[PDB]
Amino acid sequence: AEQQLRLPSPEVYRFVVKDSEENIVFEIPIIKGGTVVKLIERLTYHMYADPNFVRTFLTTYRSFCKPQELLSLLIERFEIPEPEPTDADKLAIEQPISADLKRFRKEYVQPVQLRILNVFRHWVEHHFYDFERDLYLLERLESFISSVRGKAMKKWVESIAKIIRRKKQAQSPPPPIEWHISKPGHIETFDLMTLHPIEIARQLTLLESDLYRKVQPSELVGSVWTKEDKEINSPNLLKMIRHTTNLTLWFEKCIVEAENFEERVAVLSRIIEILQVFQDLNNFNGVLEIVSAVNSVSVYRLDHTFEALQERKRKILDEAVELSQDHFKKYLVKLKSINPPCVPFFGIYLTNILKTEEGNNDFLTRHLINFSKRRKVAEITGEIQQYQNQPYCLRIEPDMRRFFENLNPMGSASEKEFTDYLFNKSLEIEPRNPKQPPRFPRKSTFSLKSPGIRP
């Protein structure tokens, strides 16, 4: 017992297979990649702890391994086979005496178990939503945590329990609310031209910033919002995207369904006015929601409507469109030259991740998971974390909140069925020239006069 530490057989303990190029690859050393087994070994290594790798793994692991499979691998890493007891030691349990038995425990078993526990602590602290999404997983973790060899692990078991109870039991002056033709507590009259344009923006900025905060880096790693069971692994992500879609299609609907020309012009200005308030609140998601709406096929062709806008109002719009063009060049410099609160544009993060994930392949195929890929994506998701911090100093307005949350411009029709309708409706309200205009009469009777953006 003064030479080589005797590890178990790799026939009965996979993790102890020899470090080779065909199962583990580097850049305490940085993990470039490995087999899932060898990642779990380094994640819970005997020689040293590795907080950096702990954090990154737990963000990124769902891109190469199911939560249930992770828990099973950790449990497997925990249940380490040890040397033949001996009758002397078998009595001694009723701590053992054998030199080799004592050494295998203190040097290999004791630390490996301690590190597995710290991973559980980190898992339930930061990524508890795994256990919320699957209660059978939560039962497994607990039914394994309660059955741990009680002496030096007791504080660690109780700290994970303490966290799990805390997580379970979870389930600077502001300005005045602006009102227009619609008056509070009366949802009946609620519409784009009846509510005050500043408060539409404020409420959309509040809704969109809240939807922003709830997106976890987990949902973005692995491109997992574009896969077969995307619903479970990217629920907040999807809400954000669906909102954007639904609101973009609403702004369109509002414009093109105003058949009367004068109304449509007032409706387009009101949207450009809402776009300004987004700019001032630094809600670029809403600036771009509006931009997309006006840059849609049904809207963009309405040349006579755009021509009846004011010089200044066309210019604002064109500077918002300026942000988007040349692969979002002005936008990216406009971002990180600003003090929050702020909601950045989400689509550009999704693209810049998606090109990283096509440009790097997940296996390493050397005649093997690319964890370095995942680390670089984790760093890219760290940019998102920056603006889910300083929230907005605006008062939520419950009824408006719900008006915007329960928008459904598409109806029981599909997206491509609805946008088809928009295009034909667009041609119906502004035909191709030379053709005389339709003098379509007004549908509503509310005042078109804008209250105009100053609080």
| Domain hosting residue 198, numbered range | 175-346+387-455
Structure determined via: X-ray
352 & 443 share domain: no
Sign of CA dihedral 240, 245, 248, 249: negative
272 & 405 share domain: yes
271 & 378 share domain: no
367 & 451 share domain: no
CB 283 within 8 A of CB 204: yes
Number of domains in the chain: 2
328 & 301 share domain: yes
The answer to whether residue 297 is domain-embedded is yes
142 & 286 share domain: no
Q: Which residue is it, tokens 């199962």? A: 23
The answer to whether residue 60 is domain-embedded is yes
Task: Quote the DSSP letter at residue 14.
Answer: G
30 & 85 share domain: yes
First-to-last C-alpha distance (Å) of the chain: 80
How many angstroms is the resolution? 2.7
DSSP β-bridge partners for residue 24: 34
335 & 291 share domain: yes
CB 303 within 8 A of CB 363: no
202 & 239 share domain: yes
Contacts of 433 (CB under 8 A, 6+ apart): none
Which amino acid is it at 164? Answer: I
The answer to whether residue 288 is domain-embedded is yes
378 & 413 share domain: no
The answer to whether residue 1 is domain-embedded is no
For 3, the 3-state DSSP assignment is coil
Task: Quote the DSSP letter at residue 195.
Answer: S
191 & 112 share domain: no
| CATH classification of the domain holding 131 | 1.20.870.10
Neighbours of 231 (CB within 10 A): 10
The answer to whether residue 326 is domain-embedded is yes
62 & 127 share domain: yes
Q: Which residue is it, tokens 């809600």? A: 283
Q: Cα–Cα distance between 455 and 447 in angstroms, integer?
A: 20
Contacts of 231 (CB under 8 A, 6+ apart): 238
Q: Cα–Cα distance between 182 and 188 in angstroms, integer?
A: 9
Q: Which among 162, 76, 61 has a CA at the least distance from the CA of 121? A: 162
CB 31 within 8 A of CB 371: yes
